[PDB]
A and B are shown apart, each in its own frame.
Chain A
Amino acid sequence: PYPIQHSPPNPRARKPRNLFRPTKIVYPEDELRRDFYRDHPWELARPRMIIELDGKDARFLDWSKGLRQRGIPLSGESVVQRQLWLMENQGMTKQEAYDKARHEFYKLRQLEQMERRIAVEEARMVGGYFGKDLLTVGMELENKTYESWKKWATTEIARQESARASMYTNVVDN
Chain B
Amino acid sequence: GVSPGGALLRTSRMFSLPPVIPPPPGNKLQMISERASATEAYPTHQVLTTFESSRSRGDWGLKRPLPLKSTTGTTYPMVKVKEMDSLEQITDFTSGTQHGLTLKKFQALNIPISTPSEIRPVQRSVFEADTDVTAFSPDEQIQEAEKRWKFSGPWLAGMTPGEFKEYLAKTVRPKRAEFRKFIQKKIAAQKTEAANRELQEKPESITDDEVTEYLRRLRNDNQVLYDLVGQFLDLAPLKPPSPYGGRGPPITHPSAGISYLRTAAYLNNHPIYGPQKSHPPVQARVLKPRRGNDAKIGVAGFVADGPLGSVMDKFDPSIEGGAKLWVNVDKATVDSTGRVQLTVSDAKATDVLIAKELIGDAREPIFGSAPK
Contact = CB atoms under 8 A, between A and B. Distances in A.
Interface of A: 25, 27, 30, 33-34, 36-52, 55, 57-58, 61, 76-77, 93, 95-96, 98-99, 103, 106, 109-110, 112-114, 116-117, 121, 124-125, 129, 133-136, 138-139, 142-143, 146-147, 150, 154
21 contacts: A25-B9, A37-B18, A39-B252, A39-B253, A40-B252, A41-B44, A42-B99, A44-B46, A44-B47, A45-B43, A47-B49, A49-B13, A50-B13, A50-B60, A51-B60, A93-B135, A95-B135, A134-B104, A138-B301, A139-B324, A146-B321
B16 A50 contact: yes
A49 to B, nearest CB: 5
* Interchain residue pairs A-B with the least CB separation, the first 10: A40-B257, A51-B61, A143-B321, A95-B135, A58-B11, A42-B258, A109-B260, A45-B103, A43-B257, A41-B42
Contacts of B169: none
A72 to B, nearest CB: 8
Interface in B253-282: 253, 255-262, 268-269, 271, 282
Contacts of B12: 52, 55
Given A45-B47, A95-B134, A39 B101 contact: no
B17 A138 contact: no
Given A40-B252, A110-B262, A150-B317, A139 B60 contact: no
B260 A113 contact: yes
B133 interface: yes
Nearest to B254: A39
Contacts of A39: 150, 252-253, 257
Given A25-B9, A58-B8, A113 B261 contact: yes
A33 B260 contact: no
Interface in B1-55: 8-19, 21, 42-51, 54
A103 to B, nearest CB: 7
Contacts of A154: 317
B338 interface: yes
Interface residues of B, number: 75
Interface string B50-72: 11001000011110000000000
A135 B18 contact: no
Contacts of B43: 41-42, 44-45
Contacts of A33: 16, 18-19
A69 to B, nearest CB: 12
A134 B108 contact: yes
A38 B252 CA distance: 6
A121 B268 contact: yes
Contacts of A99: 133-135
Contacts of A110: 260-262
A42 B135 contact: no
B107 interface: yes
Contacts of B269: 121, 125
Contacts of B346: none
A38 B317 contact: no
From A34, A37, A76, A147, name the one whose CB has the most chain B CB atoms within 10 angstroms. Answer: A37
Given A38-B21, A38-B252, A45-B102, A147 B61 contact: no
A54 to B, nearest CB: 12
Given A25-B9, A34-B19, A44 B44 contact: yes
Contacts of B129: 103
B78 interface: yes
A106 B260 contact: yes
From A44, A135, A154, name the one whose CB has the most chain B CB atoms within 10 angstroms. Answer: A44
Contacts of B365: none
B117 to A, nearest CB: 22
B1 to A, nearest CB: 11
Interface string B300-334: 11000000000000000100111010000000000
B18 A34 contact: yes
B296 interface: no
A30 B19 CA distance: 8
A128 to B, nearest CB: 9
B64 to A, nearest CB: 13
Nearest to B134: A95
Given A34-B19, A139-B324, A42 B260 contact: no
Nearest to A39: B253
Nearest to A55: B8
B186 interface: no
B46 A48 contact: yes
Contacts of A41: 21, 42-44, 252, 256-257, 338
A150 B322 CA distance: 9
A135 to B, nearest CB: 5
A113 B110 contact: yes
From A45, A96, A125, name the one whose CB has the most chain B CB atoms within 10 angstroms. Answer: A45
B60 A45 contact: no
